Structure formats: structure tokens, C-alpha cells
Design a binder for this molecule. Structure first.
Ligand SMILES: [Ca+2]
Ligand SMILES: [Ca+2]
Lengths: 642, 257, 258, 645
């Protein structure tokens, strides 16, 4: 491919109908009540550009203006199914991209000079659009230099760096000519979908490729989305191999997929389906994943054995922490699987045999599960009452209740949560707080307080009236919003713990409250419930004993000085230096710190000290000071209840 | 003012017994069978046998899935069940198969209204109003939706529709009550005057008591509204939109208890 | 002021009807099974006020099997509603010839003789019907209504005796207590609301009560109160209560005087 | 060859139990008459069963009625439960007591006949006390056989002929008595029930193989025959039948002899009806001759010869004619019956009457037994603009008005309606409406007064013959469902229409008419209909009535007919009582003949016609004149004269 030998893409005949069909469902059935007026079309227009050119370095300001005269008119066009503005902008910038990758291949002949005072901003999302071919070459001067230093900082020769980036910019050229009309339609609908809320989506029909996997035959336990050009881990399945190796976290981005023995294949700016196909393959086997965390670059590798979810793994696990005389039961609930409430009841009877003084329910990094199990589990600790109010895309509020007037553990209760405790875990924790049944410890929760469903765009008369038999897609849109028994929504706030562990008293990267166009937080009328108790009396003495212990604790001391560091250097979180000596030093010093943190840990534990950070066993388990401190909080509560 | 609640007529019961004999034969093309399953569904619906109607309507679709008429009734029934989402899909299916099927704007409008989406209900009911402006019930249904947006401009628009029109159709008398021009008693006096027999009486009562029921519902008088919805439904003119929405309203008062 | 939501066909009634069509269209039925199932659908059509459809099934049942008392009973009920008292008498007599223990044929023949202007003979049937279950308040009511055309005072004495003899558990004795003078129309209606547990029990109470109230006002010559009360009885759509069918007959008689 | 009790003792068939129950349902519930089958009513039923078994009170003994009359009040319950045995035990008893009389009667035929006394015979023994002992029973059949003997003597028979005729008659009376079925006992049992309610109510036995054969050959001389015990009676006549044409036959006439194509008169006295009717029903063209004992007089019997045929349509049709009187003219419509299409024929003829410039019209409805109620109303409506014509009440209380609704008058000039004692149902409705509207003068006699209608109902049920195939077809009942009332609110029952000018035979109490039938429903009123009277002729009545009396004073026809009324009313207290002296009876016979011949010969001298020397030389087809019509024409002209003033 040397010129415009790239096919100019056409709308298929079906796409007319499908646009009308999705405008019916979002404009009428969506939980969020928006007007597809002039203001809303504008915002749709903007987000389509940001899907075409995420980094504001392909299109010219004079190319956005050529179509932005009719930005307010894009509502009417989606209703009527006039798709040409979408196809004319994706055929443009299919051109403009080839221009950039052509230019980029040219700049790989020029010499690389990492000795300057210069900078690279990774957030160009609200950038002014490029004026001329010069600034388009200044931004791709910057871009190819960053790509060159990233590979240098992982110890690569001038030779290796030039042939890797050649292969990247020419497969980027070849990828650009493999896209079909379903890819440009898919992105057009996404601009519509994502302007309503971030959980709304259009989803293209599956090809035989899904047919043939099911016909004849299994990856790691993760579900993936697209940050532009980046494959993001959306969520992880409870007790999956992904979830077991606690290195992988929600919102993290892959840059390469290696197999056993064979080389690391770089997956920079790919279509998801091909990236995910590299990871997926039958039982027993292994796959290694080089990935980079959420918010410069870090050369992190994870290695995982492929599996089917094992029931005992996703099962609740119980154990007793002892502190001299006193004991504390701990229920690790990885997920809200059908049958959880029954397994919990079994383990609670074991906990009453061992004369514990208090119990911790651990719901850190629990992606929700059966709303039904959240309610039954809530109900084990209260006599009876409402647990959650549900409001639908119609005005209707439903109350879900526990109605046996029974308490299977009436003793002191702590719920441990973090920023990855989702839907179910939030409902349980919120109910235990509102009823005055339990102290809530850890970080503010995720805040995804809404539910989505899928709907086929197929209609029963399609095959009878059409040649175009290709199954059509689905939409995915928000139908329901959870509210607490106190009438507060879990949206965007989730549950604030009664004692916030130091990472939670910070702005986070992850959580619904930072998602693009997340629905607001709002209230309704409180349900009718009898509070089982009140722990607000105890809060100040529990909070004072907590601060006293974490001040004399090396783990919490270490985690607090990284927070004093992470918030101080927040100014430049997106601005990266292009000087090899500055970047190598900051890489060397991270490793020196990490090694000295591990070696300070091992000196306490009587474990021999590491001389290289590379000698650390790949299965190393980080300790849990959040759990060990929550046990003390749980015992303070058992004491304070006299 | 009460009618004898309507009873099935001898013609309805003859036709139904005939439709059974004919559907039980193998004399019918697929198209004739689907038309006659639709005709019987309309008749079952005309007697308030909605589950039997839905059963015939679904059989018709199975055979011939490109029937807008059937899609219309299916959405009406998803509205009555409170499945507004499903209903909007059904009416959109009507208008895709036939964009001239006007009553799908009426019924989608009404469904959006009960569905808590009056701006969009006004789009459909304004359109339906435009297609026949002298139909007083189009000014009534539009008004009810517009009242949720702004009660003042709703009453101005209503009043404009009345003054524009030739004012011949009986239902303008219900508009005149909504506007202030006449009393509940004058409305009922004209209702008796214009009714020529028990059937015309019952139809006027099913219509009028429903709109009276909505008036009282807006002042917060739940007992007068409940009575008036009940008395509309007691005329057994099943198949009037007013009868179906009388029953839905009673349902909403019930599910509040 | 006490109103029910007028009854709507239940989902079970509509499912069973659609199922009875599929079975009657099949060859899964013996002549005897076919006749039984045509009778059962007639009862169901009648439950929904589809009397011409019902009559059609009842007549097909007889065509197959002419010795069915159940069917003769519904045929006479329908001749009563049409005002053909003569034919109706013949049908119920046919019932009791085929089965002398078919008790409700005394009820329905009694009612038909009553509307037929033959109170002495209506008292013979309704007295008999009363003897077969004396704690059924509606037997004391129907007997009373016939006996008041013969002798207004002995009727009230007999009614009063039936009430004092009974265990007075069944709701309908409250309508008797109103007929007697023991309670007001307002107390009757207050007890009506108290005893109704749901919309269906409400509707049934109203269909029953408003018909007996209708008869009370009709005996004082109040045609407007009668007419309203009959209409409001019939507006509960409890098709297949004798009170619904005789409410409709009374409205028919008020029509035919115009 | 019956010489003692070889008469088989009859018993109920299995069906009869049910049929009694079935019949008791319909009469007690469906009948227009609202009676209690209580104590009082069973008694009256019992009495009428005895009177059906022994009409003449000369077969049973007061000791035999008393044996069963202890439980007479109980016979209501027995008919309900279908316990028939009291009917069969009385019919088996009376059958033997009847055998006793006919053998004793054969004994008295040997004794001498003596017609020379001062003695009499009462022919009505219906409210007579029952015979005490065998001495009353032989005194009454001494008397019976003497009357039977004098009847045959007075028709010129010798001692010899008289003894052999009565021998056959008394031996066939015995032989007939042992042909009777259980169906004959049941038939009469139900008749006692039926006829106690009203005289038009009946039980009707199923038709056999024989009725099937008659239809197979499908003639009746145009008459319907009813039975008054021990007599075959002409109940009604069909319009334009051969019976109705030869005017020598009137309603209530008793048949005592039937003739053949060529042959002697065979006696049919004491017969069952089906067998009597079999003598008459013969091939068309080949005639049959019948004897006639008429209503209520010492038995002088007429013989009539009539041919058989089907009802020819133009004989049943309306017939029009013009009477002239010097200059003035009067149209006459002879309406024999109210056939479907009458009103259309009338309209045609009324337009012909317009052409001939007539000053009044007469509608003649003498001897018109009714017809289609619908035609009564349309025909009524031709002379009024519009209004109700007749109100009909049913068994259940419903009153319905039949109306003329075109506001049209197709004649509007002076109208007379001519009626007699044989004008029934439809004729009465028309005449009653013409009087009440003030539209027409009504002339002639008081009408029949049958103001009720009857229908037939099968006692068959659709499940007879799945449950009881042994059973044959069962009977019918015939019961009164409807009663006619005028627009004035008066019923036509028992009174019918009183004419404005009563022609002399009408004022005098009549033999025939509903008001003399046994247990006829009463006359009663209802609320008048709303109607606008088209006129008022009460003004004219006295002048019309005085000119009428002036003419009929000078008229030998009317003079003769008034002298027979002074004769029939003077010999009224002793009217059924008949003498047993041959000299007094032959004299009364001779003088009737002398009178009749002198009346005919006075008529012939007026007409210029040659005189008769013996009453037997009168041709059998002689046509009696119509002075009632000729006088009605003058009445009609008086009205046109009085009206045009
Ligand atoms: Ca509980
Ligand atoms: Ca006329």
C-alpha cells in the first residue's frame, strides 16, 4: 500500500434501518431521559471525532470545520438513517492516518537524540486541533521519538528500534485497509451510545468465528473494552486465573501477548477481536501478558495458566485471626454466586463454635453478582426489612426484602471494601451501614449503581422482506438504578466507609465518578425499616485507636509516603520527559525503592534479603496490612460493645 | 346517568361461532388464515377477551410476520401490561411496515405518556392531531400529554384546537368542560341529548367518565377519579382506548394502595 | 357509592377456552366425552356472558346425548331470560324427570313461574328448594319475593322465621335483615365493604345486593332508583349469578313499558 | 258373542303414567286460565269424568258414585303423580253396568209398545239425581227404550222393523263396548281434566297406521267434528267447503246416519268419532249423504246429500255485487273467511264500487269462523286512517296491540257490517273495531263470542326412545294461550259484538255461541288503547231503528220469523221434555210440515211460481231467500240519506 489504494468504504443497505432502530430504543427506552435535539447532536459529533482521532494528531482544524457546519443536524440524520457524514469522515482520516504512518516511516531514517529538555503530553484529548501540515509533523516528530525512547528504555539497539517501529507503522497501514463498513457503522453508533452514558453500546453481529469455537471447543477470566488503541480489562470473573494472580487490576491496558517459549508480539493499536483471540485457546496451556497499568510506561509481565472457573475457588473462604486471647472470623467473599447465603450460614455456625468476638465480611475487589444473593446475605444480619430499592426506565420503584425475622449472627460485624467493590457488594455494605448493623472499613466503592440489558435489532419480518439475511446487532442500554433503603443512590458515591484506609482519602483513577458522562447521583423517598442498632457513638474512639496503630506501622508508613509523593507530582501526571538520562534514572530509582521496600519487609520476617529485584519469585504474595488493621478495628468494636 | 352495561350482541356471537368452523377447515390459504385470525382477534378484543385476542394475533404473525395491524394491537396490550419498552418496539414495527398506519402514532403517543415521557408523547399526538384536526379526542389526548410539560400552554393549545375546528363531533363537549366553558351537569345534559339508544349512551359514558376521571385525578380527588374510572369500565365498550386507560388508571391506584 | 372494578375475564378462563377449542377440533373425544366437554364450554361461555355461544354448545351436547339434565337446566334459564316462560317450564320439568335430585331446577323453575305471574306454584318450587338447604339466605330471599305477591304480611313473618331458625353465617343474611327492617341500606352497604376481602368478592356482593335493593325500590314504585340499582348490579359483570340475569330481565321489563 | 262379563278388564299402558304428569305440567303452569288444582278443582274434575262415563245418569247407581267419591278431592294429587287407577276402576265398572242396561233393554224389546199415555221423556238428565236401586235403573230404561221405539215409529216403521233395528243397535252397543283400548280410557280421563279448565282445552291421542294410510291415499266435506257425549257433532265448517255451500248444515248439528254413493242410511249413534268420519271420507265426485239432528228440539231429522272435493280457491274468495233500490245503489262484499290475500282482493273491488257511484257499502260476515288475525287488522284499516285494531293478552300477562299504520282510507263513505251468531274471532275483531271507531253501523245478531286462541303442544320429549323404545309416539295437549280485547278494553269473550240494529233472531236467547259452552272463560275488561274515533253514528240510531221496525212490520218473511220466536219463547220452560203419545207427536210432525209448506207456498205466490201440493216435491237444491240482506240494503241507504244531510 503506497497511495490511496485503500477501498473507499460504503454503508451496506441494512445500516439505513439499523440506525433508525437504535434511535428508537435509546430515545424512548433508555433510563436517562435526554432530548436528541441540536445541543445533543453537537456532543455526539465531538465524540465521533475523538473516536476517529483520539490523540488530536491525524485530522486538521480545517477538516473538522468542513463537516462541523452541520454538527447540530446529526440528531435528524440518525433518526432518518442518513449516515454519509460518518462515512465521509472515516474515509477522510483513513487518508489522513496513511499520511501520518507514511511520514512516521520517513522520520525512522532521521537520527534519534535523547539529550534535550523536551516533554511529551500523553493527554492530547482537549487539545486545540492541528492548524497545518507542520504541526501535524511536529506532533509525529514527538510521537515517533516517544515510541523510540519506550523501546530504548527496555534495552533495544538502534537496529531493533527501527525495524520494530517499521513493523508497527506498516501493520498500522495494513490494518487501516482491512476495516469494513461494519467497523465504521459500529463506531458511529458508539458516538451515539457513549454520549448517553458510558455503559450504553451498539454490538455488531458475530461471524462464523464464534460459531467455529463453540462448534469444536477458553482464555483467562476477564472481559475487555477499548480505550482508544488500547485493550482495557473491563472486569474479572470471581476466582478466575486473572483474579487469582493479584497483579492484574480493573482498568489495566495490554501492549503485547507472548506464548510459552515464543517471542513477545506487540499489540499496539489493534482491533479487540484479534487481540482477544491471541489470549484465548484450549485447556491446560499457558499465555504470558505484557501489560501497562492505569495512568508513563512500565515493562510489567504477568504469566497465567488457562482454566474453567473452579467452584471451591469462587466459594466463600473462612479463617480465624487470633490476637493474643481474642479471635475474629473472616469471610472472604470473592463474588455473589447463587448459593453464597447457604455457604455463609454453614461457616457462621463454625464461627460460633470457635467463640469469636467479632466477624469481618471481606468484599475487596468483588465485581458484584446475583442481586438476589446481596439481599439474602444482607438479611442474615438483620431480622427483616428492605435491603435495596430498584427504579426502572418507566418511573416504577420495586423494594427487595429479607422477610424471615431471623438473625444468624447478632454479634459485632465489620464489612471491608475497596474501590473495586461493585453493585452487589455496595448493596450489602450500604444496607449494613443504614441499618446501623456494621462498621464499614476501607475505601469508597466503585459507584456503578445501574444495570444494563441487551436487545436484538432483528425483527421477525426482516428475513421475509430482505436479501440482507445477515443477522443484525444488538444494543446494550441502562434500564434500572439502585437506591439505598435511606433513599440515596449508589451511583457515583457508592458506600463511604465509617473508617477510610489511607488510599481511600484520595482522588482515585478508577470508579464510576470518573467515567465519561456517568449518570448523576440522586435521591428518592426512604423505605420503611427498623434500624438494628447505632455505631456512631463509637466512631471517634475507633478512629483514634486506628490512627495510633497505623502511625507506628511500616506498611502503612510506606503506603502514606507514596501518597504524599503521588499527589505532589500530580501536576505533570501526563507530561513525560524525552531525555534518556532523566528517564533511565527515574526507572533505576523506582527499582531501588521497590527492592528496599521488599528488603525492609524481609528483615522484619527473618527472610533472606534480595540483591536484584529480578530474583523475586514470580508468585510472590504482597502482605495484607488492610486486613490485619481491620482485625484490630473489629476487636476495638467487640471491646467497645462492653 | 347510567347505561345498561353492553352485552355481547347476537351478530358478534354468530360471527365468532362461524369463525371457529372456518378456522377448523383446511380450505384456507396462509394469507386468508392470517386475515381471519386478525379479524377474530379484533372480535375477541371487541368483547374484552384480550388473552384470546393476543393468542389469535400471535398465530397471525407466526404465519405472516409483516402485518402492521397485528403489531398495533400487540403494543396496545404491552401498554396495558405496563411493558412500555416492548410496546414502543411494536408500534415502531407498525410504522416501519406502513408509515400511513396513523393510529400507531395515537397508541405509541399514549404508551409514551403512561411511560413518563411526555415530550416524545407530544411529538406523536401532535402528528396524530395534524392528520385529522376535527377529531376532538386528538385534542383531548394531546392536551393530557402537554399538561405534564406546562398546564398553561396545554390549555391555550387545547382552546386554539376547539376554536379552529368545525365543532360538530360530540366529543368537543368534553373539550368545553376541560376549558371551563360548560359544567359537568351541562356536559351530562348534552350526553343524554346526543345519545339515541343504550349503545350510543354507553359509548358516551365510557368516553366521558374516563376524561372526567382524569380531571378529578389532577385535583388529587382519588375517590371521585376511582368512581369515575369504574363507571367508565362498567359500560363494557371494551375496545375504546378510554376503557383500556380507565382500567390502567384503576390499576395504578390499586398498586399505590 | 360502593363500586367494584367491573370483573374482566381471568387468564385461566381464556386459556381454558382456547384449549377447549383445540380439543373439540380433534378426534380425542368419545361421543360421551364430546357431550361433557360441550357442556363444560357452555358453562364457561355462560360465565363470560356469551349466552348464544353457550346455547349453541348446549344444543350440540343434546344432539349427541339427549338425556343430559344439566343442559336442560341452562336451556330453561335462557328461555326464562327471553320471556318464554312456557318453554322454560317444559325444559326444567325435563330436568327433574331425568334426575329428580337436580335441586337448582326447583330454583330456576320457581324463578321462571315467578316472572311468569304464577306465584302460588313458584312458592311450591322455592319452598322445596329452601327445604334442601335452609341456611342459604338466597333461598329465603327468592321464596320471600314470590310469597309477597300472595300475602305481603305472611311473607315477612316466614322470612323472619327462616332468619331466626338459621345459623346466620352466610353474608347474604344481611340482605334478609334489610328486607326485615333490622338494618338500614347504609348499614347493609357498610357490612358489604367489611366482608369483601378483594375486588372479586366485592363485585359478587354488589351484583347480589343491588338486585335485591332494586326489587325493594320497585315494590315502592320508585322506577328511577330501581333502574339505577339494576344497572349497577349488572355493571359488576358477574354474568351467571341469577341476580345478574334477573337484574337484566327487570331492566328489560322497565324498557318494555316505555 | 258377549252374554255376561267377557269384556276384558282394561288397564293403563306403561307410557300413561308419564303422560298424565306431562299433561298436568302444561295445564297447571302454561294455561291462560290461572286455576288451583287443589281440593275443590279435583272434585269438579271427578264429576265431569262421571258425566263422560254416563252422560244420561242411567248406567251408574248412587251407591257406585259414592264408593269412589269419598276420595274425589284427592284426584289433583293423583293426576300429578300419574296414578290412573280410579279412572280405570270407574271405566271398568261403568263398562259392566252399561252391559247390564243393554241386555235389560233387549229384554224390554219383547214387551208391548203403548203410545197412548199422558207421559213424557226429559232428554236433559245431566243435573238429575243418581238412580238409588235397580228399580230406578229399569224405570229409566223402560223410558229409554220407549223413546227409541217412538223415534223409529214416527219415521213410518212397523212393530217388526222397530224391534230388529233396536236389536242391532243394542247388540252393537254391547259389541262396541269390548273394542275400546286403554287409549280410550286415558283419552276420556284427560278430557275430564282438559274440559273442566275451559271447553277449547283437549288431550289428543296419537294418530295410528290408519291416519298414515289416509295421507298415503290423500274428501272431508269441509267440516271439523267435535263430540258432545253420545253424539257426532259438526264443530266448525271450512269457508267455501261443500258442507258450507249447501246451507242446510249449521254449526252444532248432530249426525245420526250416513249414506253411500247409492245406498241406505246406516245409524252412527253412540259411535267413536274416527269410525264415523271414515264413512264420510270418500273419493272426489262420488257423493255421501248424512242425516242431521239439529240443536235443541224433539228429534225431527233432516237428510242432506253432499258431494266431496278439495277447497276450490275462488269459492273461498270475496264476492262483490250491487243492489239497486229504484235509483240508489249499495255495494255488498260477501267475505266467507279471512284468507291470506283478502285485503288486496277487497281493495280491487272497492275501486270497482267507486266506478258504479254507490251511496253505501255492506261487508257481509254472516257465518265466517275467522281466519288470519293479520287480515282482520289490514281489512279493518281500509276504513280508518290509522290506529290500534285489537289488543292481545297472553298466559304470562303480556298485552300486544296489532295496528293499521298507513294513515290512508280506501273507502271513507257509509259502511254497514252484517254479522250473525256464526261470525267468530277475525269477523268479531273487524266488526268490534268498525263500531268502536264510530266508522260503521253493525247489523244482524250478536256474534259467537270465541275471544280466545289455542295451540297444540307435543308431549314427546327428545330423550323418549333413547330411554324407553317400548313406547310409541305420544299425544298432544291443546290449551288456551291468548285472549282478544277491543280497543275499548272490552273482551270479545262470551258477548262478542252487539249489533247497533239487532235483526229479530238476535235478541232472543240463542242455542249456539261461546256464552252457552260448558265452563267458558268469563268476560273481563282491560285499559282502553289510545285511538282517534273516525266518526259517531249514535246520532242516527233512533231514526234508522224506527224506519227498520216500520218495514219489517209489513214484511211476510220477517213476520213469519217473528211468529216462530213468539212460538219458541212461549214453549221455553218445557223445551227438552218430549211427549211419548204417538197421536200428540204425529200431530206436531204433521203441523210443522203443514206450516213449512204454507210458508213456501205463500213465498211462491208472491214470486209468481207454481204452488207445491206436498212438502216432499221441493227440489233438494231449493235456495231459501235472504230477507236479512234485502233489509240491510235499506238500512245502508237510510244511513247514506241521514249522513249526506
Ligand atoms: Ca433475616
Ligand atoms: Ca288505513
Amino acid at each position: 500500500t503506497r497511495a490511496d489504494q485503500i477501498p473507499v468504504l460504503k454503508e451496506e443497505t441494512q445500516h439505513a434501518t439499523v440506525s433508525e432502530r437504535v434511535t428508537s430504543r435509546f430515545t424512548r427506552s433508555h433510563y436517562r431521559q435526554f432530548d436528541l435535539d441540536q445541543a445533543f447532536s453537537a456532543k455526539i459529533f465531538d465524540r465521533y471525532l475523538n473516536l476517529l482521532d483520539y490523540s488530536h494528531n491525524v485530522l486538521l482544524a480545517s477538516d473538522v470545520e468542513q463537516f462541523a457546519k452541520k454538527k447540530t443536524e446529526l440528531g435528524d440524520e440518525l433518526r432518518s438513517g442518513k449516515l454519509d457524514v460518518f462515512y465521509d469522515l472515516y474515509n477522510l482520516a483513513q487518508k489522513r492516518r496513511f499520511e501520518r504512518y507514511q511520514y512516521a516511516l520517513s522520520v525512522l531514517e532521521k537520527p534519534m537524540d535523547f539529550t534535550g529538555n523536551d516533554t511529551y503530553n500523553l493527554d492530547r484529548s482537549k487539545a486545540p486541533w492541528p492548524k497545518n501540515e507542520a504541526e501535524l509533523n511536529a506532533l509525529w516528530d514527538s510521537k515517533v521519538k516517544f515510541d523510540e525512547l519506550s523501546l530504548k528504555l527496555t534495552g533495544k539497539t538502534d537496529k531493533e528500534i527501527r525495524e520494530t517501529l517499521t513493523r508497527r507503522y506498516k501493520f498500522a497501514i495494513r490494518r487501516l485497509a482491512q476495516t469494513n463498513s461494519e467497523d465504521v457503522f459500529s463506531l458511529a453508533m458508539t458516538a451515539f451510545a457513549r454520549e448517553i452514558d458510558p455503559h450504553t453500546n451498539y454490538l455488531s453481529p458475530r461471524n462464523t468465528e464464534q460459531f467455529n469455537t463453540e462448534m469444536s471447543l477458553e482464555g483467562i477470566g476477564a472481559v475487555y473494552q477499548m480505550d482508544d488503541d488500547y485493550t482495557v480489562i473491563n472486569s474479572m470473573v470471581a476466582g478466575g486465573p486473572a483474579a487469582k494472580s493479584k497483579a492484574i487490576s480493573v482498568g489495566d491496558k495490554i501492549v503485547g501477548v507472548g506464548q510459552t517459549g515464543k517471542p513477545m508480539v506487540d499489540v499496539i493499536g489493534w482491533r479487540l477481536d484479534d487481540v482477544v483471540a491471541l489470549i484465548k485457546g484450549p485447556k491446560g496451556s499457558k499465555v504470558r501478558l505484557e501489560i501497562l497499568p492505569a495512568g508513563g510506561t512500565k515493562t510489567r509481565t504477568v504469566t497465567l495458566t488457562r482454566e474453567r472457573i473452579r467452584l471451591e475457588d469462587r466459594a466463600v473462604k473462612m479463617s480465624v485471626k487470633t490476637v493474643g486471647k481474642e479471635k475474629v472470623g473472616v469471610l472472604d467473599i470473592p463474588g455473589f454466586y447463587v448459593g453464597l447465603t447457604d455457604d455463609v450460614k454453614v461457616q457462621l455456625q463454625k464461627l460460633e463454635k470457635q467463640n469469636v468476638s467479632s466477624v469481618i465480611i471481606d468484599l475487596r475487589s468483588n465485581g458484584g453478582g446475583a442481586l438476589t444473593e446481596a439481599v439474602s446475605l444482607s438479611g442474615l444480619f438483620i431480622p427483616a426489612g428492605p435491603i435495596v430499592q430498584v427504579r426502572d426506565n418507566n418511573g416504577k420503584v420495586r423494594e427487595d426484602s429479607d422477610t424471615d425475622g431471623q438473625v444468624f449472627y447478632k454479634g459485632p460485624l465489620v464489612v471491608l471494601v475497596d474501590r473495586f467493590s461493585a453493585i452487589a457488594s455496595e448493596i450489602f455494605a450500604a444496607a449494613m451501614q443504614d441499618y446501623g448493623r456494621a462498621l464499614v472499613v476501607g475505601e469508597p466503592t466503585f459507584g456503578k449503581g445501574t444495570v444494563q440489558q441487551y436487545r436484538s435489532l432483528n425483527r421477525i419480518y426482516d428475513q421475509m422482506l430482505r436479501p440482507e439475511w445477515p443477522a443484525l446487532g444488538s444494543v446494550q442500554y441502562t434500564i434500572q438504578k439502585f437506591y439505598r433503603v435511606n433513599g440515596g443512590s449508589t451511583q457515583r458515591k457508592g458506600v463511604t466507609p465509617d473508617i477510610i484506609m489511607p488510599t481511600g482519602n484520595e482522588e482515585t483513577e478508577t470508579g464510576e465518578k470518573f467515567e465519561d458522562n456517568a449518570l448523576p447521583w440522586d435521591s428518592i423517598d426512604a423505605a420503611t425499616y427498623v434500624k438494628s442498632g447505632d455505631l456512631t457513638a463509637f466512631e471517634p474512639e475507633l478512629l483514634k485507636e486506628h490512627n495510633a496503630r497505623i502511625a507506628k506501622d511500616p506498611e502503612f508508613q510506606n503506603i502514606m509516603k507514596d501518597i504524599a509523593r503521588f499527589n505532589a507530582m500530580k501536576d505533570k501526571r501526563n507530561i513525560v520527559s524525552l531525555n534518556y538520562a532523566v528517564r533511565e534514572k527515574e526507572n533505576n530509582e523506582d527499582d531501588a525503592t521497590r527492592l528496599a521496600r521488599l528488603n525492609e519487609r524481609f528483615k522484619r520476617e527473618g527472610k533472606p534479603e534480595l540483591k536484584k529485584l529480578d530474583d523475586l519469585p514470580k508468585d510472590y504474595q504482597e502482605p495484607d496490612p488492610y486486613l490485619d488493621e481491620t482485625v484490630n478495628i473489629a476487636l476495638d468494636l467487640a471491646k467497645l460493645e462492653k | 346517568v347510567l347505561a345498561v352495561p353492553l352485552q355481547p350482541t347476537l351478530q358478534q356471537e354468530v360471527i365468532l361461532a362461524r369463525m371457529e368452523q372456518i378456522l377448523a377447515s383446511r380450505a384456507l390459504t396462509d394469507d386468508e388464515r392470517a386475515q381471519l385470525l386478525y379479524e377474530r382477534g379484533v372480535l375477541y378484543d371487541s368483547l374484552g377477551l384480550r388473552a384470546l385476542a393476543r393468542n389469535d394475533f400471535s398465530q397471525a404473525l407466526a404465519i405472516r410476520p409483516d402485518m402492521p395491524e397485528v403489531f398495533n394491537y400487540l403494543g396496545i396490550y404491552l401498554t396495558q401490561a405496563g411493558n412500555f419498552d416492548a410496546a414502543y418496539e411494536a408500534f415502531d414495527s407498525v410504522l416501519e411496515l406502513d408509515p400511513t398506519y396513523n393510529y400507531a402514532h395515537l397508541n405509541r403517543g399514549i404508551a409514551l405518556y403512561y411511560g413518563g415521557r411526555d415530550k416524545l408523547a407530544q411529538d406523536d399526538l401532535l402528528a396524530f392531531y395534524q392528520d385529522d384536526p376535527n377529531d376532538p379526542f386528538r385534542s383531548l389526548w394531546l392536551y393530557l400529554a402537554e399538561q405534564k410539560l406546562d398546564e398553561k400552554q396545554a390549555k391555550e393549545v387545547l382552546k386554539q384546537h376547539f376554536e379552529k375546528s368545525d365543532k360538530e363531533q360530540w366529543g368537543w363537549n368534553i373539550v368545553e368542560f376541560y376549558l371551563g366553558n360548560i359544567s359537568e351537569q351541562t356536559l351530562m345534559e348534552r350526553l343524554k341529548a346526543d345519545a339515541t339508544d343504550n349503545t350510543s349512551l354507553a359509548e358516551h359514558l365510557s368516553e366521558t367518565n374516563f376524561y372526567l376521571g382524569k380531571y378529578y385525578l389532577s385535583l388529587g380527588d382519588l375517590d371521585s377519579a376511582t368512581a369515575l374510572f369504574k363507571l367508565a369500565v362498567a359500560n363494557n365498550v371494551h375496545n375504546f382506548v378510554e376503557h383500556r386507560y380507565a382500567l390502567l388508571e384503576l390499576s395504578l391506584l390499586g398498586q399505590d394502595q
